[PDB]
Design a binder for this molecule. Structure first.
Ligand SMILES: CCCCCCCCCCCC(=O)OC[C@H](COP(=O)(O)OCC[N+](C)(C)C)OC(=O)CCCCCCCCCCC
Ligand SMILES: CCCCCCCCCCCC(=O)OC[C@H](COP(=O)(O)OCC[N+](C)(C)C)OC(=O)CCCCCCCCCCC
Ligand SMILES: CCCCCCCCCCCC(=O)OC[C@H](COP(=O)(O)OCC[N+](C)(C)C)OC(=O)CCCCCCCCCCC
Ligand SMILES: CCCCCCCCCCCC(=O)OC[C@H](COP(=O)(O)OCC[N+](C)(C)C)OC(=O)CCCCCCCCCCC
Ligand SMILES: CCCCCCCCCCCC(=O)OC[C@H](COP(=O)(O)OCC[N+](C)(C)C)OC(=O)CCCCCCCCCCC
Ligand SMILES: CCCCCCCCCCCC(=O)OC[C@H](COP(=O)(O)OCC[N+](C)(C)C)OC(=O)CCCCCCCCCCC
Ligand SMILES: CCCCCCCCCCCC(=O)OC[C@H](COP(=O)(O)OCC[N+](C)(C)C)OC(=O)CCCCCCCCCCC
Ligand SMILES: CCCCCCCCCCCC(=O)OC[C@H](COP(=O)(O)OCC[N+](C)(C)C)OC(=O)CCCCCCCCCCC
Ligand SMILES: CCCCCCCCCC(=O)OC[C@H](COP(=O)(O)OCC[N+](C)(C)C)OC(=O)CCCCCCCCC
Ligand SMILES: CCCCCCCCCC(=O)OC[C@H](COP(=O)(O)OCC[N+](C)(C)C)OC(=O)CCCCCCCCC
Ligand SMILES: CCCCCCCCCC(=O)OC[C@H](COP(=O)(O)OCC[N+](C)(C)C)OC(=O)CCCCCCCCC
Ligand SMILES: CCCCCCCCCC(=O)OC[C@H](COP(=O)(O)OCC[N+](C)(C)C)OC(=O)CCCCCCCCC
Ligand SMILES: CCCCCC(=O)OC[C@H](COP(=O)(O)OCC[N+](C)(C)C)OC(=O)CCCCC
Ligand SMILES: CCCCCC(=O)OC[C@H](COP(=O)(O)OCC[N+](C)(C)C)OC(=O)CCCCC
Ligand SMILES: CCCCCC(=O)OC[C@H](COP(=O)(O)OCC[N+](C)(C)C)OC(=O)CCCCC
Ligand SMILES: CCCCCC(=O)OC[C@H](COP(=O)(O)OCC[N+](C)(C)C)OC(=O)CCCCC
Ligand SMILES: CCCCCCCCCC
Ligand SMILES: CCCCCCCCCC
Ligand SMILES: [Cu+2]
Ligand SMILES: [Cu+2]
Ligand SMILES: [Cu+2]
Lengths: 382, 236, 241, 123, 51, 236, 52
């Protein structure tokens, strides 16, 4: 929801999300929904974004309407920040448990230490039920099961109220007598030495001694109970296992890419060389969370968000099968209302008019090839 | 008569208006207020911003101009009883200023903390800031300026000169509003994070310190209270 | 003027209550702005309440307003509760926002977004000033105690959140699981400035070392802010802005 | 000159130095970019230069070689992930206006000290 | 590298995406001079009025 | 007589000498002045440096010593007319100082900016710096010291004490010259760049601020002018 | 490995071995871009003749 505001070129060349899937579109309270997919870290990572040496797999959502039960990069849990390598592809999986009823736009996002939020595609997920039914049980290594919704809440309230009461008692003890104007006049007109006299000093000594003694006793009591404690577990996690993708058999060279100002279409001329041993056909162009599809070649069945999906938004001048070894140059047009709705056309405002994206090539059998393209994006006005 | 029921209104107007504002932002926080380029964001928060800015400018002009036009010309021939009454009215103004300062600099400022920590910053004019930077801050600025003008124009103690602590107490917290330029600049250029303790926020901190001039202001108002009707009783 | 001694006393009491309101809520606003923009991130999250940065930073940046308000109130009225009133106002503002916004507006649990406790340090600062009226003695001893008692004062609250949990193959404290589960879209994990370990962290010394560093820096900050409050207590008039 | 004129007139009218530091310095900071826009606007016409998009000013910097001034030294807007919408110029202008208020306030007193007329009995 | 000729013969033409060809040697020079002279004149008029 | 044609010479000597210096550096900037280890660099710029340093030392010594030796011993028996004449001569000295300050701190300083932005810094003693650090800066230092000494030795107002604003105006801009040590150190060790706004240059900035003491100096000279021959007319 | 366990004054002892830099290098430790092969000892009870 915070996207459509970030720079178009920055959204185009940071992280490309694809093969996204959602286990459910509509869930009950306490029910789990799983979000899977892959993200590729673009090689032309903008210099204004710090390299993803410290990155966190986050979820874009309006507060804890879901709780993040688990999150994985590769196949291992990532509750801390992780190190990503530029040019690598990683698979991810986030498990969410529904907590608050409503219709929520859930994004998978990557927060980068010195670059800010990189928001992936967002999907509307409906939660039904009551928040009062939500439970978040955890079992500790000390053998007790607690609900994270209300665990320690009473203790927190008690201690805060107790210390607030002590402070209020101190202030009220001094506030029984007149406060401001008579005391000011006594201090000014001559030596005061009369508004602070025993047993005021005795009360202050009692307050100080009781405060120190109560702090010490409470610490000792909180040590006898909960004798086993550990510090907060933190630290960036290295060694994220990237995907071992095969080298693509399709090479694409971008010769000029243009978009009309104003307009809802982006045009580029590609020289595609087909290696391997099967006729290929261009089926998809993904630029920034927006999938332009050639409906005659590929159809989306993963329930991709409709406002981000252009079913027939990709038109290839010659999308006939490309025989192996053959090289041809085609004009590719990616047109959809999403290009203006998600403010991809506002790259004219950007100080770096370069685009990046993913091309998906499909053969007759159905297996697909992912090739990455990047080029300057030249506006056209006349 | 002395202290009248203007104090009740002073508390109640801020309390009721800000409770309604909190209800409004609870209803339209999400759902017309998350997407800054969505059409309903314009009718529920941009319209709010426009209306509140216009009303703030108009109210400030009217209030300050009225207070300055009705200023007491013959302050010399003011009896101690009427001076005590005016001192109590000025104290009511200071109470309203303190209440507005609370609402602006504590409630809506930390409320904007939570909002910006739970959502992705989407614009410079988010629902939280609309309520904090451009409603609560102008409201307490208007109240503080009005209290200063009332003191200067009705209290002989605060006349014949500009009180330095009062000027600091009134203008420093005002400087938090132009400091929003540093906040927006420091959030879009500096610090691609949501750290609330980032040095881009030290503009609010430094000019929030100037509210400590309330101590000098209040001893000045105590002296103004204790001019003719200081007692006796007090030191007697 | 005033009619009699009784009416003067009643007027003084009314002034007392109104001026107490003014002082309390101006302090609430200013102190809360300062605190939330100098220590608020740690104060917001239980998984930020660590042994190094939280313990270090919070007393240092929080001793500011108590020092100034003490230098005014004690000096001018012999009222020994400047630190206590500052800390109570900060706690009230923080709790109001936590309950009505952190838990009210958004739905973060209170056991996740509770603030830190500061009254013990405030009480030490106030009593050490009233006894031994020396501001220098306060700045040295009372600020030392204010810095040192912070973590032990908060240990009864946060200790249950530090029970170890075996969470999906990794060791995590309960506060860690709270931070993991209750998603903060704007607050990724790496922003967390918490203890992460060093090659020069000798033995079990993280909390005491941080506490003593905070106590020393609190001495320094109290000394500076005593004079800052002295300036803010001036009663000067200007002939022209 | 537009900022200077604002600063001078806002001082002469409303003789308050504080009012000048707040309002006139605000205007001085805010009017800078609009004051220079008629000059630099023609240099921001887009050009398709050897396959890459460049403004006329970009082409000037590229063509007229500054041996001592390589391109990376250029401290210019390069985009951030927190640059929301079309806000770069107004946000910078308002930040400059606020900082101009602060710097004017400091330098008023600096100028007072430099305007002192003291004599010393010995260096 | 030896260069022969006259600097006055140098041309640096560029064609913009708006369909106009300009010489980078002198493009916008007149506009720059005009605006700077205009604002300098305004400031000088202010100072001279007071002088 | 009062103001004589020494002002014309004061303007013309700096104008002509610096126009010739600019012609010299235009002729020998490239082509004996690009390669600091080339033999013709030694005869066209190192020799220039040596000669200018020697001549600056000699001229400073002679001028300051003459001004101090011819100092007015009987300042008490100085008539208002001669005092007015000496005030005008001191104003001519201040005009020469202002002209030299312009030439040093604006023209040749930004001229060194262009030079160092267009070529590769090759040495600490480039043609641009030879003209800026070691010619124009010493020249304005000599002029400022001479003006200060003339005021102290001929004007009774500036006698019987060292004027703080005059001392700042004269010594602060002088401190820019030893600040060259920071410039060279900050260009060879810090900041492998040619950023003109680098903090290695803030030494010139800070001590360039001290030239603002000309305001106090000038009000002092106004008072010295308006001692006996203040009028009447003025305030009459 | 250690060439000797007991040496005379002016006698040489050689320490050999291998070290592997762990892939999961902790983020609190800066990457070993600048590292020095040192010897842990109570002052110059030995002098470092060579290190490889
Ligand atoms: C110091 C001087 C301060 C000046 C600024 C004051 C700002 C006032 C609010 C701006 C509203 C806006 O701009 O929005 C206009 C809103 C938009 O809501 P709607 O879409 O019409 O929905 C229906 C309206 N509900 C959602 C409110 C139910 O509608 C309105 O007309 C109603 C605005 C009512 C404001 C007055 C009540 C305040 C509480 C009572 C105690 C005072
Ligand atoms: C004490 C404070 C008083 C406030 C008075 C405001 C008057 C505005 C006059 C019109 C300006 C305009 O229309 O122009 C503003 C331009 C718009 O820029 P753009 O959309 O990028 O492009 C140009 C598009 N045009 C050609 C259609 C304009 O710059 C900005 O973005 C700044 C807008 C944010 C201002 C925030 C002020 C908050 C005030 C809070 C008071 C409580
Ligand atoms: C009543 C008078 C006698 C006692 C006086 C105090 C002597 C020290 C007691 C240590 C107790 C303990 O627990 O040791 C200290 C524990 C570690 O303990 P460990 O993990 O068991 O280390 C076992 C290995 N040792 C034995 C080598 C430690 O933390 C610390 O490193 C705390 C370090 C604090 C540094 C800053 C101090 C600043 C002081 C300022 C004074 C104005
Ligand atoms: C007027 C001043 C009053 C001060 C009152 C102090 C109360 C004592 C607290 C016991 C500390 C403790 O028990 O050990 C240190 C613990 C840290 O433990 P941890 O790393 O979290 O380990 C977790 C496991 N637990 C739960 C067992 C701890 O707390 C602190 O870091 C605060 C250290 C400050 C103590 C300094 C006191 C020295 C005397 C002061 C001399 C000038
Ligand atoms: C002017 C200075 C006066 C000094 C007075 C000192 C009184 C100490 C009271 C007992 C505290 C205690 O026992 O607790 C200290 C705790 C121990 O922490 P722990 O071992 O990690 O765990 C908790 C283990 N318990 C539960 C068994 C305690 O914190 C510390 O590590 C701080 C110890 C270093 C203190 C350095 C002080 C140097 C003083 C120099 C004087 C010349
Ligand atoms: C006359 C009284 C009523 C008007 C009062 C002013 C209200 C705001 C007008 C915005 C116009 C505009 O153009 O918007 C602002 C334009 C962006 O516009 P966009 O790209 O179209 O974004 C469309 C999406 N929105 C609708 C969510 C914006 O730039 C900016 O973000 C400017 C940000 C400035 C931040 C610092 C301000 C500090 C103020 C200090 C006060 C003392
Ligand atoms: C006494 C004070 C006088 C101030 C006079 C201001 C003149 C108005 C200029 C219009 C701005 C504009 O048109 O939009 C903003 C543009 C930026 O546009 P860009 O990003 O370069 O886009 C390039 C495409 N263009 C050519 C269409 C722009 O300029 C600025 O950033 C300056 C913003 C400052 C405006 C603040 C005014 C708000 C009222 C002040 C309230 C207290
Ligand atoms: C405040 C006290 C300041 C003291 C320092 C003054 C520095 C003077 C210049 C140093 C020259 C140097 O050092 O170089 C010596 C140069 C080297 O050139 P050349 O190879 O002989 O070529 C032939 C000479 N041309 C290239 C100049 C034609 O030749 C000379 O003999 C001539 C130097 C003439 C200097 C006097 C004229 C100045 C302009 C007229 C108004 C005053
Ligand atoms: C050389 C440094 C060593 C530490 C001494 C620093 C204290 C100096 C403070 C000071 O300037 O004097 C203020 C008061 C004066 O009160 P007196 O009227 O002198 O009271 C004397 C009786 N008494 C022992 C109970 C206090 O006297 C006091 O401040 C209290 C004196 C009692 C010491 C313990 C008080 C502090 C409790 C934490
Ligand atoms: C962020 C830093 C905290 C701000 C605190 C700085 C206050 C500086 C003191 C000050 O303002 O001096 C006022 C003089 C004008 O003097 P006058 O108006 O002649 O008043 C006569 C008495 N007096 C000289 C002692 C003031 O100097 C002037 O020219 C008037 C300027 C007054 C501005 C002070 C308002 C500060 C609000 C932020
Ligand atoms: C509470 C803060 C709200 C803003 C007010 C701050 C201005 C305070 C400045 C001040 O201290 O007074 C200096 C002059 C005094 O001149 P006066 O002789 O009072 O002139 C009154 C007639 N007049 C309305 C045309 C000015 O009066 C003026 O400065 C000018 C007053 C007219 C306001 C508009 C002037 C500013 C133009 C940009
Ligand atoms: C970069 C910072 C800007 C520099 C501004 C700092 C000026 C500090 C004021 C100052 O210099 O005080 C002079 C006293 C010597 O006093 P005396 O020579 O006894 O003069 C009697 C009258 N007076 C005490 C008020 C000066 O103290 C002395 O010992 C004489 C030292 C005078 C040096 C001032 C020259 C500054 C040139 C850079
Ligand atoms: C001293 C500051 C008091 C702030 C209380 C506040 O924010 O109240 C809003 C909150 C809203 O929660 P709730 O009461 O459940 O009503 C929800 C209505 N909305 C969502 C519009 C806020 O609770 C109340 O309205 C209680 C009334 C307290 C009167 C001093
Ligand atoms: C009064 C203490 C001020 C200390 C300033 C500070 O903490 O800055 C941290 C920052 C280091 O940047 P970092 O924390 O790494 O920011 C990470 C996020 N990005 C890269 C987007 C800024 O340093 C600077 O950029 C200079 C600050 C100048 C202060 C006058
Ligand atoms: C108020 C400062 C004036 C600076 C003028 C200047 O640097 O002049 C040198 C420049 C040199 O260009 P140009 O006139 O073409 O003669 C070239 C001769 N060289 C190359 C030696 C400078 O132009 C002139 O000599 C014009 C005379 C202006 C008299 C105030
Ligand atoms: C009054 C503001 C001063 C701010 C200083 C500054 O901008 O320094 C930038 C520099 C950062 O170096 P950087 O700009 O990356 O320099 C790049 C070129 N090299 C690496 C050759 C220095 O930081 C430092 O080295 C410390 C400066 C201390 C100032 C008292
Ligand atoms: C850094 C603390 C400085 C506080 C300034 C107090 C000045 C008082 C002058 C009366
Ligand atoms: C940072 C600005 C401080 C300016 C110093 C002025 C001192 C004046 C004393 C007479
Ligand atoms: Cu969304
Ligand atoms: Cu990619
Ligand atoms: Cu290893």
């Amino acid at each position: 929801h915070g996207e459509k505001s970030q720079a178009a070129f920055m959204r185009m060349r940071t992280i490309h999300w694809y093969d996204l899937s959602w286990s459910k579109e509509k869930v009950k309270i306490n029910e789990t929904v799983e979000i899977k997919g892959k993200f590729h870290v673009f090689e032309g990572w903008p210099e204004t974004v710090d390299e993803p040496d410290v990155a966190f797999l986050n979820v874009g959502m309006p507060g804890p309407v879901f709780i993040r039960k688990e999150s994985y990069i590769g196949g291992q849990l990532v509750p801390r920040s992780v190190r990503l390598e530029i040019g690598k592809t990683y698979d991810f999986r986030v498990v969410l448990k529904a907590r608050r009823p409503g219709d929520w736009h859930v994004h998978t996002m990557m927060n980068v230490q010195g670059g800010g939020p990189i928001i992936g595609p967002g999907k509307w997920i409906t939660v039904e039920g009551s928040m009062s039914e939500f439970r978040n049980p955890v079992t500790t290594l000390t053998g007790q099961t607690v609900d994270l919704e209300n665990y320690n809440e009473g203790n927190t309230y008690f201690w805060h109220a107790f210390w607030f009461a002590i402070g209020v008692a101190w202030i009220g003890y001094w506030s029984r007598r007149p406060i401001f104007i008579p005391r000011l006049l006594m201090v000014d007109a001559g030596r005061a030495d009369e508004l602070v006299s025993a047993t005021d000093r005795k009360v202050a000594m009692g307050f100080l001694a009781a405060t120190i003694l109560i702090v010490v006793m409470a610490m000792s009591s909180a040590n006898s109970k909960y004798p086993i404690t550990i510090p907060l577990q933190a630290g960036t996690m290295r060694g994220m296992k990237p995907l071992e993708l095969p080298a693509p058999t399709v090479s694409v060279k971008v010769e000029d890419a243009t978009y009309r100002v104003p307009g809802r279409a982006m045009r580029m001329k590609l020289t595609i060389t087909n290696h391997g041993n099967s006729p290929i056909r261009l089926g998809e162009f993904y630029t920034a969370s927006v999938r332009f599809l050639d409906s005659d070649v590929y159809k989306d069945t993963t329930g991709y968000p409709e406002d981000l999906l252009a079913e027939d938004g990709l038109s290839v001048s010659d999308n006939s099968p490309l025989a192996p070894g053959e090289t041809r140059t085609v004009d590719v047009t990616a047109s959809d209302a999403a290009w203006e709705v998600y403010r991809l056309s506002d790259i004219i405002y950007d100080p770096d008019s370069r685009f990046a994206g993913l091309l998906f090539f499909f053969d007759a059998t159905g297996n697909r090839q992912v090739v990455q393209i990047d080029a300057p994006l030249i506006p056209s006005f006349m | 008569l002395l202290d009248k029921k203007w104090l009740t209104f002073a508390l109640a107007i801020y309390t009721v208006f800000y409770l309604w504002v909190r209800w409004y932002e609870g209803v339209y926080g999400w759902s017309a207020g998350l997407d800054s380029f969505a059409p309903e964001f314009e009718t529920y928060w941009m319209n709010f911003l426009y209306t509140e800015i216009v009303l703030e400018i108009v109210t400030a002009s009217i209030l300050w101009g009225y207070l300055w036009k009705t200023r007491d010309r013959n302050l010399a021939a003011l009896t101690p009883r009427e001076e005590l009454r005016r001192n109590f009215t000025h104290l009511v103004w200071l109470v309203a200023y303190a209440w507005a300062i609370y609402w602006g600099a504590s409630y809506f400022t930390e409320q904007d903390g939570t909002w910006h920590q739970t959502i992705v910053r989407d614009t410079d004019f988010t629902p939280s800031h609309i309520i904090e930077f451009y409603l609560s801050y102008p409201i307490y600025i208007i109240t503080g300026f009005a209290a200063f003008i009332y003191a200067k124009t009705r209290l002989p103690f605060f006349a014949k000169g500009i009180s330095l602590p009062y000027l600091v107490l009134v203008v420093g917290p005002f400087m938090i509003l132009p400091n929003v330029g540093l906040n927006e600049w420091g959030h879009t250029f500096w610090f691609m994070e949501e750290l609330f303790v980032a040095p881009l926020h030290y503009g609010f901190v430094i000019f929030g310190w100037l509210a400590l001039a309330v101590m000098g202001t209040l001893t000045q108002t105590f002296y103004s209270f204790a001019q003719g009707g200081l007692g006796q009783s007090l030191c007697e | 003027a005033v009619r009699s001694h009784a009416e003067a006393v009643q007027v003084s009491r009314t002034i007392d209550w109104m001026a107490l309101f003014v002082v309390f809520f101006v302090i609430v606003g200013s102190y809360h702005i300062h605190a939330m923009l100098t220590m608020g991130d740690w104060d917001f999250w239980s998984d930020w309440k660590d042994r190094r940065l939280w313990v270090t930073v919070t007393p240092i940046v929080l001793v500011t307003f108590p020092a100034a308000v003490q230098s005014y109130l004690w000096e001018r009225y012999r009222l020994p509760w400047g630190a206590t009133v500052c800390v109570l106002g900060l706690l009230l503002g923080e709790w109001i926002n936590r309950y009505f916004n952190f838990w009210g507006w958004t739905y973060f649990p209170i056991n996740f977004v509770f603030p830190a406790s500061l009254v013990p340090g405030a009480i030490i600062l106030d009593t050490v000033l009233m006894l031994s009226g020396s501001y220098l003695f306060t700045a040295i001893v009372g600020a030392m105690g204010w810095g040192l008692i912070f973590y032990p004062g908060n240990w009864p609250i946060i200790a249950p959140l530090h029970v170890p949990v075996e969470y999906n193959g990794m060791l995590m404290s309960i506060a860690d699981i709270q931070g993991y589960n209750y998603v903060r879209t704007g607050t990724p994990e790496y922003i967390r400035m918490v203890e992460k370990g060093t090659l020069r962290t000798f033995g079990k010394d993280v909390a005491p070392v941080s506490a003593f560093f905070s106590a020393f820096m609190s001495i320094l900050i109290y000394f500076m802010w005593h004079f800052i409050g002295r300036w803010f207590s001036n009663e000067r008039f200007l002939q022209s802005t």
